[PDB]
Amino acid sequence: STGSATTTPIDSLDDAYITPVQIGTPAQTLNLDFDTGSSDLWVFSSETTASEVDGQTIYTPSKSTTAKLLSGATWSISYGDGSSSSGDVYTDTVSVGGLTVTGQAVESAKKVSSSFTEDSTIDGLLGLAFSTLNTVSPTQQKTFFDNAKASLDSPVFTADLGYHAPGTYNFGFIDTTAYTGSITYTAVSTKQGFWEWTSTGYAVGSGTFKSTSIDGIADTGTTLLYLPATVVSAYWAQVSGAKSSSSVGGYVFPCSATLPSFTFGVGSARIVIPGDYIDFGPISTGSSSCFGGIQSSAGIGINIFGDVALKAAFVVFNGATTPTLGFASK
Numbered sequence: 071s072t073g074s075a076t077t078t079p080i081d082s083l084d085d086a087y088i089t090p091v092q093i094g095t096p097a098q099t100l101n102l103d104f105d106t107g108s109s110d111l112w113v114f115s116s117e118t119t120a121s122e123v124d125g126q127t128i129y130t131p132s133k134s135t136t137a138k139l140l141s142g143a144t145w146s147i148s149y150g151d152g153s154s155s156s157g158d159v160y161t162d163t164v165s166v167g168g169l170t171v172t173g174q175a176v177e178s179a180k181k182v183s184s185s186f187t188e189d190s191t192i193d194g195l196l197g198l199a200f201s202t203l204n205t206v207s208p209t210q211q212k213t214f215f216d217n218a219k220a221s222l223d224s225p226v227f228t229a230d231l232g233y234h235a236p237g238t239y240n241f242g243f244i245d246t247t248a249y250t251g252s253i254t255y256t257a258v259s260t261k262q263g264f265w266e267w268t269s270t271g272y273a274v275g276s277g278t279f280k281s282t283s284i285d286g287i288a289d290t291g292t293t294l295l296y297l298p299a300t301v302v303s304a305y306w307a308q309v310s311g312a313k314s315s316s317s318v319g320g321y322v323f324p325c326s327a328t329l330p331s332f333t334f335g336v337g338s339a340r341i342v343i344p345g346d347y348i349d350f351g352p353i354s355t356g357s358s359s360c361f362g363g364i365q366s367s368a369g370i371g372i373n374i375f376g377d378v379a380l381k382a383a384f385v386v387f388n389g390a391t392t393p394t395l396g397f398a399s400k
Contacts, residue, residue: 073169094134105291113194125190275330286373
């Protein structure tokens, strides 16, 4: 089997991407944030505290003839941005782009933090990291991909995120029309539960490539590119007037700037992030200070190849017995 679904930016900055997901019988379609940095499929629901729901579409398990309470199971998750959610668990039929999993754990939120409430466009998350990170207790549950894997034509999924445009998540096949040149594959460590890999270096604009190992995670659920302070300083030093602002929470730059590109290494291959991808717009409405899309990972504890990086590539998440990651230009 295979599946193919379009993923759409939630706003004009590509802050996140939503993908329609069918849950239950008859189908209830919710728009979920596919997150290769976490491993829980959770949804706004009829159980979510009413004051914490503001415009989201909810899953109502009592209206699904295939929903079953997973008795005694609870979940609770905290994300890198400080947001969180928790609740109980149902199993139900879940379909993405024509690919169906029966008996998928659907984690129903009883509580969500303010950031989730305030984002009316995201109805929940669909985790695509390794199932070892799944938070369901006392019986850990499998991700949608893990459940689907054995049925797929090939044990892979691909992320093809758009810049200010829709893109695609495919399951079970590699669309050879969706990228240019060849795909370069690189080793993955699953020791921390992430799609963790090592970039071979970077360049800023038309500058020379610096060969240096940068361990980080491929994370579709993180907006920006978070890299070591040395690398980030070298980038922003090429933008007149750019500075790190403790009050804003990262590097800002004059909105009048033209940003240089940023290149990262994948083995001997190179992925180029155009400068425009690094512009996250005014820090507040009407400001002439703009927020940068490359930020320091210092104090996160891990480097994160988030959407800023991934949307410059066609990315293969290869879930074979020994997982790997592939990157192609597009």
